[PDB]
Every structure is written in C-alpha cells, then in structure tokens.
Amino acid sequence: SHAPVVFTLRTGIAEGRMVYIGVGGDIDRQVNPKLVVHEGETVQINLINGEGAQHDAVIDQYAARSAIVSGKNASSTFSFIASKVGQFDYYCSLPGHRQAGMQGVLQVVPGNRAEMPSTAADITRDPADLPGPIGARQAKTVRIDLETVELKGQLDDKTTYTYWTFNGKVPGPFLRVRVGDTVELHLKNAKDSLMIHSVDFHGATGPGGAAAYTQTDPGAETVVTFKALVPGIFVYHCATPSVPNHITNGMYGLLLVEPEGGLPQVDREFYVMQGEIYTVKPFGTSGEQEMDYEKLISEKPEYFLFNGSVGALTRTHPLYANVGETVRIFFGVGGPNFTSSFHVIGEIFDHVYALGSVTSPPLTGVQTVSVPPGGATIVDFKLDRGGRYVLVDHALSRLDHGLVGFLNVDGPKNDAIMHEGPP
Amino acid sequence: SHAPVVFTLRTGIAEGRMVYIGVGGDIDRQVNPKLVVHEGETVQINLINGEGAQHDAVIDQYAARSAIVSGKNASSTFSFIASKVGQFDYYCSLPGHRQAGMQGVLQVVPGNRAEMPSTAADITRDPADLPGPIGARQAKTVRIDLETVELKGQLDDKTTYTYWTFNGKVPGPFLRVRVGDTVELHLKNAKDSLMIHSVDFHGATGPGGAAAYTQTDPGAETVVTFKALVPGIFVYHCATPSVPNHITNGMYGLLLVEPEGGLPQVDREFYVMQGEIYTVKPFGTSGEQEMDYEKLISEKPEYFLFNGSVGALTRTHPLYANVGETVRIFFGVGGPNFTSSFHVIGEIFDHVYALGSVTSPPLTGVQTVSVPPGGATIVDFKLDRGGRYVLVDHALSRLDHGLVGFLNVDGPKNDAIMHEGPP
C-alpha cells in the first residue's frame, strides 16, 4: 500500500518505568500504547530516542525491527504488511530494557478499517467534477456565478478546519471558456461571511486581474465583464488581504481558456490543485485545527493537500479510468507558497504543457514537472494497462503531511508490459 | 564512627546507558564512580532518584542496600562498616537495571586514609589556646593588642576561603580580665587589608560596645579605653559594615570578665565558637570557595563550623583530657545567624551558666542548651570514664555541613558505668 498506517514512538521515563511514549494521532502521550491495525494494512513505525539510552523496537512474529538509536532525537523507521491477525509484542532488545518496561502490543484485527463518521461538510472537489470540451462555436458572452462561502470542513478523519471557498469546495469551480469569449462574472459574498472576498483571474487582462472590481462585502454582489484574450490554463484565487490567508483557507481554482482548435481529443479529463494549510497543532491531531499566522508568513505548513483534504483523492473522491484511455490532468498550485514536483507513480507524461502554455508545443516523455504557486500545467498519458497509479509531489516528505492521490484502473496484475518472473 | 565517609549518587542517563552519577566530593559528575574507602571506615551512601524510574543500590558482600526510591528526588541513605579488603559491585536490583548499566565498584583498600597536604594557612584556633584563670588580685589596667588580618585559609581537605580574622585565627584571641579592670585596647589593621575593621565587645558599656572608637583604616591603629563593669562570658566581633559579612568571614571571639572570686576551679578549660560560611558552591566542593551575598542575607549557609574549618576539632586541633578531670567549655556563637543546640554525645552538663550569666546560680543536669548568635555560655562536667565524646549542634543536619568535634579521653572500653552484656 502507498497509504501506510503510521505510528511514532518516543522512548522515555513514565509511570516509574523506561517505556515507549506515543507521539501524535490516536496514541499522543500514551505509554506503551496499543497499535491497532486491520488485516492486510502496511504498518510504518517511527522510533525516536527520547532520553539518550540505546533503543530498538522488535516484533518477532513479523521478522520486523528498527535499527538501534543511540543519541537523543536519533530515529529509525521500519515497515511490514499486517498479514497475521492477533496480538504481537513490540519490545526493545537492548540488555534489561524489556524487563525495565519497553514492551507494548500490536493488535491486528480482521476485516477493513471502517471510515470515521464526519462532523463537518465535505469540502473536496471531485477531480471528475468539471465541464468537458466546449464545441467548435463562435466567440460569445458567457455568464459565470461564483459564491464566496466560509464554512467548517472535514480536514482529516477526526479533524476539522474553517475553510474559505468559491461555492463550498476546494478547489473552486473549474471554469471553461473559448478564446475571444466575453465573461460576465457575478461574485456573491454569502451573508454569514465575516470577511470581504474577491477574485483575480491569471487569464484576465486589467487591474488585479478583476480583483479591483470584485471586492465584495458579506451579503453583497459584484459584477465585472472581461475578454478572454489569451488561451491558457490559468489559476484564479481570492485577492482580499491577507491574500496568502484567503488562498491557504481554500480560495483557488482553474480557468481553462480553450484555443480555437480546442485541446487535442482525449478520452478522460481530471481537475487537481495542490495547497498548504498552516495549523497550530501538527498533522494528525484530532479536533478543531486553527490557523497559525507565524507559520503562514514563514512558509512552515503542517498539511500539504490535493483538492482540500487528507484522503481527498484516496478515500473520498479518487480518480477512475479504463485501460486503453488517453487521460488529461489539469493540475494547478494554489499554494500559497510551495512549488510542486508533480509525478504519477507507474506512469510517464506523453505531453507536458510547459508553464501552462497552450500555444507553444508541449514537451514529450517527461517523468516529473515543477509547477509554481499561482502556476498550472496540463499533462496527458495513455493508460496501456491496469493498476493503482499514485499522484504525488516528489518532495516525498509531503506524503507524511497528507499529499497523495489514487488513479484506479481495472486490469490484470501480470501482462506483457509489466509482470512478475522472467520472460 | 561519627566521621563516616559519605558518597551521593543520583540515578540518570549518561554515556548512552542508565547509570549512577556521582554528586559533589571527589566523584562529582563521574558516571558509575569508583567509591574508594579504607578498611574499617564507616561508609554512608545517599541514593537520589534523578529521572523517575524505580531504583536501589545493593552491595552483596556487606548485606547492605538502600530502600527502593520511585519518583524524581526520592532518596534513601544506608550505611555499613568497610571491614573486608577487595572490590565489590554496588548495583540496582530492579528488573533489567543492572544489565542496562546501573553498576559500579566499591574499592576497600588496606591501611589508613592519608590527609591532603594543605595549600593555605591553618586559621583554626586550638580549643586549648586561651589564658588560664587570673589569680586573686586587685582590679587594674590591662593592655590588649588585636590585629585585623585578611588571609586565605584551609576550610576543608581540598577547599580554601578568604577569611577575615583577629590575629589570623578563628575564633579570635580569648580575652581574660577581672571585673572592675580598665582595658586599654589597641587595634592594628594590617597594611594588606582591603577593608576597614573594628570591634564591638558585649562586655563593654558605651557607643558600639567600642565600635564607634575602633573603625581602623588598613595600615592604621585605633586605641580605646573601657571599664569591665560586669562579670560574664561575652562574644566580641568586628562591627564594620556589612557586620554579618565581617562575622561570617571569621571576626568573632570571647571576652571572659571573671567575677571577684573567679570561676569555680576545674582541672581543664576549652575555647569553642560556632559559625556559618555562605559559599556559592555547595559543601564538599574543592577549589577556592567564594562568598554568596544572596545566601548570607537569606540565612542559607553551606558550612557550619567549630573554630573556623572542617575537621578543626576532629583532625587538626581536637580536645584531650584524662578520666576523673572536671572540664569547662566556654562555648559562644559568632553566627552570624543560627542558634546552636549545643550537646556533647556521651556526657551530661553538671552546670550550665544560662544565657552566659556568671553571677546567677548555674542550672544542673542538662543534656542540651540553646545559645543564640551573639551569645555564649559555660558548661562543665566530670569525666567519669573514657571515650571519644562528640561536640554537636543537635540540629543534626549540620553534621553534613562540617559541624562536629572530638573530645578524646583514654580509658577501658567496658567498666561499671557502661559495658557490653548484662550487669
């Protein structure tokens, strides 16, 4: 699995004994905590030396163990598949340490992990939720309605956050016009909003890319008209101060201005944006997460997310496609601050629309592409065969802050393209 | 023995192991220190819990152990006689703790502990260094010469201190006159003094008990005349500010004004004074000790002393007498701050001159007497048999800050007054 169940253990002194102490998630501050796992899960255990004696962690029945950590903060992580149901001791093998109290239980339970019942609104955009290619047709006036809505969202399994959105979801609505079109934009600020909201389009020409015309009080509406003069895949975002605050809380989307010829024919299109959230408490903490200004202005986030939430593109709203289909991903970074190294594990991009230019020829046979904040790109590839394909920022420490997505494709395990054993 | 060899161990994590860490003395900060002891010595080990797991210390061959100490700072002291030469493990008996590093050696060496060659002047006043009884004699004019002297002294085995003294010793000269006498006092302050010095006698009547006429610059001399109008046993001390500072540094002594008859004849007299020293580093620290002003004004000393130094009346200048003698101790407290609960282990005070009154009838058959700072008394008793008799302040935590003394008396171990076995 590419979504492991993760436990962190710090060694220390508690309850009169030398013990393991849980760090974060369901086990924060618990001594020799029970590590509860469902049959077939991939288990990652992070050991961190707390007090400065020599430690490891060993699970006999799984032939699994950490390395020995000597100094304070010295760390070793290990993994295994929970293939066996029952109760297994994790313990320190250093002389005396097990007898001194370094022992807990790993419990492996039969059947799959139930999903935790949510407490707040689902604020993740389905990656399939976008309008398809516009016909060939004459340029014309297109009317777009945007509503700025502040609302609590399910950030993780048992953690919530106050999101600011376009139309109650992150990213906002996928906007699709033809070059030459005239856009008639209506921005309504919901009555229950505390804050002024706005929108800047990177595909609009003029002051604030429309921000100067769209500063909207709560319970008010603004209206602006603008010509789509350039074809491109453009990010749009709120542009009321603090702009970085409005962006991190979720006020970003994509505007595709199609060129006259349209993009190349493709079997299936998806919508994905990457952002950061700057919380007071670390990734994994349950309850109401709140915003940490000091972390926002110093570019030190706790959450890296696709489409608004942890599990957004794995559990709640993953991507589905069929073997033999050509797939297009419109991929944008709201940010506000981090450049994404976008990669699909198990795939190679046939075409990459460099800097999101839709008029310059796309680059060919590319593994991984840099997308800046306030930037976007288009990748396409042919699905030759089945598998779970994984969307990642190849700054791979971001796996441990929520940044992972699934493209699920039904097919055999073994074919001519990739198989176990030799020819 | 009333001079046990003392070691303090704190449990902790050091050199990547769970260990014992030496606290002060020759073992400060050493991990699992070697405890070096001489054959026949009484050993005291204080175990203090550092990090908060359960611990003890055990030495198999001496059937000795601490109690189990559980939380941080929890302590257990134990003792035994080092009767067998060789090497012996002290260890923690809690499950795994020995294996995990909680083990050191006690080395019992043959022969007697050698004394450290001293590095500074001996500032200790011998308890026999006082003038004998004044004959019957008419009242008259007596000239007394005092010199105020600043000098480093041997405070302990391997520790020094800047003492301020009358005539280079602590306490100062025992002054002996008859009531009605006229005292011609000369006070020479040494050239090499940083500070002004002076003297207030409690047996003198008028401004500052002479202090107003004795404020003496370095290299200068004051002369003052005063009448000894009252019989008593009077403490005298420097009266130059800070007076507490001048007293702690050594500037106290005793003035006996004999009544017309003189005091009842006794076979042998002794001179003893108690005081405190207020150092930055705790009791037992080697090196030059320095004064801590915050500890002096808050009355939190590190040394409690008889006649100026640790070992003053045990090692360097102890008391000596013979069976059948009547003994008198002039005992005063310089202080500056603490009241002494004066007592001689193995003896009872035949007479106590309550509040140092020499004219009121003495109290009889008294175990222990309170002497305030700036007060003295007289005690006498008959030595009915032999032994080492021990001078103490019976606030007995002051044993561990250097306050103990020996009266050595040659006689058999067993006799009619106290013996092994039944009658």
Ligand SMILES: O=N[O-]
């Ligand atoms: O394929 N790398 O995540």
Ligand SMILES: O=N[O-]
């Ligand atoms: O017997 N007194 O310590």
Ligand SMILES: [Cu+2]
């Ligand atoms: Cu361990």
Ligand SMILES: [Cu+2]
């Ligand atoms: Cu906004």
Ligand SMILES: [Cu+2]
């Ligand atoms: Cu922008």
Ligand SMILES: [Cu+2]
């Ligand atoms: Cu122990």
Ligand SMILES: [Cu+2]
């Ligand atoms: Cu003085």
Ligand SMILES: [Cu+2]
């Ligand atoms: Cu006084």
